[PDB]
Design a protein around this nucleic acid. Structure first.
Ligand SMILES: [Zn+2]
Ligand SMILES: [Zn+2]
Lengths: 188, 189
DNA sequence: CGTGAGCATGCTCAC
DNA sequence: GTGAGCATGCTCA
């Protein structure tokens, strides 16, 4: 997808380095099922009060783009809910008291929204912890299809203020697969 | 709880083997998902009328024996129904007009019973076609746990007249895995 | 119909 | 827990 730093210079950042690892040249996150991944939110200017941060997954390949990304039938019933996220949601937020799990009434896409909070004292960014509740390979779900996670900064009214994204692969061996995908990578 | 021929010499045989292939030394059937496997029903003397044949799967390993063998959530919902077999049943019967899919309300175990039919003209055994609707590897299902299929010959009152059983591995490459398991089995020293 | 090599990807098991 | 190697479904010459 195409980014939109917008008027507040909004963009993501990732801690360097397993259970979670980010590849810059690929701008792809590799992580294990249900493991927390910290994502940094950077702005050049403080967003208006009441701004929100939304996370959503969409299939990368054009031919799958219209299909809603949801958990596979096995994990959807594996009883591992936190009492807040609906079972069919792939993406969950950890360490936040006000998550909102939504489903678009038109597209039926799932998303989890959290309030935007300015960086703590001494920091240049604010961190949000995300979890993916299915592997990219789960049958009846992502089915080995790569996805993109779209992080959008919106105002209290739900208007787009900024947007960024990264590709993600939820798998058993993040470190192994990242290396495999980086050496198989061809540029131009 | 043990194979046994009974008053009718009831035992199983298998057309010999790939899609579907049996290994005598292993007494194990290696087949592909949803592919028909013909198993032969042998008897020393014809059993009474009203006799039926039931098929049931159970996990081989003791620490799994108590868990019901059923289809994984993905396949249970993958609309491949045939209009009769409940969607969660692993074993289905092919080419038989009236199979009966039951679920023991006490053990919750699935089984499919079919009426017993004497061999055709010029044959010594009767053949029943089964097929498995999940791979042994299905996550949420057998999850790589080996199962045993138990075929029982019972009369119209449900009384056991004989029993037999074989191991089964439903997989993508039956020939590759049969060879591997037979190779590994030879290592009994 | 019918072949076979290599790989993708969750799992298991020594050090 | 850390790297090696296996188990097992899929892709495609
Ligand atoms: Zn899943
Ligand atoms: Zn299955």
């Amino acid at each position: 997808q195409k980014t939109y730093q917008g008027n507040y210079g909004f963009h993501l950042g990732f801690l360097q380095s397993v259970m979670c690892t980010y590849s810059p040249p690929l701008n792809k996150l590799f992580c294990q099922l249900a493991k927390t991944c910290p994502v940094q939110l950077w702005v050049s200017a403080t967003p208006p009060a009441g701004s929100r941060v939304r996370a959503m997954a969409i299939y990368k390949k054009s031919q799958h783009m219209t299909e809603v990304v949801r958990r596979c039938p096995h994990h959807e019933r594996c009883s591992d809910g936190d009492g807040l996220a609906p079972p069919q949601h792939l993406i969950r937020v950890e360490g936040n008291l006000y998550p909102e799990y939504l489903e678009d009434r038109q597209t039926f896409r799932h998303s989890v929204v959290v309030p935007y909070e300015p960086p703590e004292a001494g920091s240049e960014y604010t961190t949000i912890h995300y979890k993916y509740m299915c592997n990219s390979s789960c049958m009846g779900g992502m089915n080995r299809r790569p996805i993109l996670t779209i992080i959008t900064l919106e105002d209290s009214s739900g208007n787009l203020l900024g947007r960024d994204s990264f590709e993600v692969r939820v798998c058993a061996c993040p470190g192994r697969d990242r290396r495999t995908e980086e050496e198989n990578f061809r540029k131009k």
